Structure formats: structure tokens, C-alpha cells
Ligand binder design. Structure first.
Ligand SMILES: [Mg+2]
Ligand SMILES: [Mg+2]
Length: 158
């Protein structure tokens, strides 16, 4: 997507949960680092539309396979380490986050449809596992996201 005048790229992130107090955790393509799905917002796209596009592209899912349970109100920002900053220059992402419950079967997820996948694949992890496990520069954002979505996911686990 197009970079704003502050160097931040508008971005959507996706936390997909089940009814067992678990969230979908995905392995970055060709790496041993893991994250939640995230993607850019195209010009003319709403955040929700961008979310469903990134859901289709890299998780293989339809609106019909999920239900939106929550979203974050404003932008959550992270800055890249100086080493990872590659005209115009992107220094980080400003993110809107969505909590989805997977209602279709696990077999509906397909992370291998792109010629260059974001992810190798995924597994279910315990709810709080992502906070300690994501790359450190995203940890502050992840902590806030997971805190905001906490009450909803724990209700399904009961
Ligand atoms: Mg992505
Ligand atoms: Mg993507």
C-alpha cells in the first residue's frame, strides 16, 4: 500500500480464534519467526475490505468462513528497526486489528495459494503465546491487541 506523510503504511491485522481459547499462529514463509496475518490497505479500500482481501489471499478464507467478533478503534503503530528500513520510505505500519472466529472447518484454511506465500502454514496456539513469541518490535502492538480482544475469546473458551 501507499505510505503516508509520516512514513507509516496503513495496515490490517487478523487474530483468528476458535472455541478452545486458541488463536491461529502462522509461520513466516521460509523463516522460524511467527506472526498473525497482516496486509496493506489499497487506495479506495476500507479496513474491513482490506482485511477480507488479506484473509482470502493468505488464509484462503471467505467472509462465510468467519464472523467478526471485534476490532480495534484507532491506529496502532509500530516502527521498523533502522536496519530493516529499505522514495517514499516506509518506517513502519499503522494498523487496524480484527478479531475473527473461525466457523468453518480447519481444512478450509489454505496458506499456499500465492506464488510467494506470506506463510508456510499455521497452528493453533494458546491465547497469550503470541505476545512473547512475535518479533520484539511488534510486541507492544501485540500486547495491546491481545489485551483488547481477551474478554471475547475467553467467553468462547468457557
Ligand atoms: Mg501480509
Ligand atoms: Mg499480504
Amino acid at each position: 500500500s501507499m505510505i503516508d506523510d509520516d512514513g507509516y503504511r496503513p495496515n490490517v491485522g487478523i487474530v483468528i480464534c476458535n472455541r478452545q481459547g486458541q488463536v491461529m499462529w502462522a509461520r513466516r514463509f521460509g523463516q522460524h519467526s511467527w506472526q498473525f496475518p497482516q496486509g496493506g490497505i489499497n487506495p479506495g479500500e476500507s479496513a474491513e475490505q482490506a482485511m477480507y482481501r488479506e484473509l482470502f489471499e493468505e488464509v484462503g478464507l471467505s467472509r462465510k468462513d468467519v464472523r467478526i467478533l471485534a476490532s480495534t478503534r484507532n491506529w496502532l503503530r509500530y516502527k521498523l528497526p533502522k536496519r530493516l528500513v529499505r522514495k517514499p520510505v516506509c518506517i513502519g505500519q499503522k494498523q487496524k486489528w480484527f478479531l475473527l472466529q473461525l466457523v468453518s472447518g480447519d481444512a478450509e484454511i489454505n496458506m499456499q495459494t500465492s506464488s510467494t506465500p506470506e506463510f508456510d502454514g499455521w497452528r493453533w496456539v494458546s491465547y497469550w503465546y503470541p505476545v512473547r513469541q512475535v518479533v520484539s518490535f511488534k510486541r507492544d502492538v501485540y500486547r495491546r491487541v491481545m489485551k483488547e480482544f481477551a474478554s471475547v475469546v475467553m467467553s468462547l473458551a468457557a
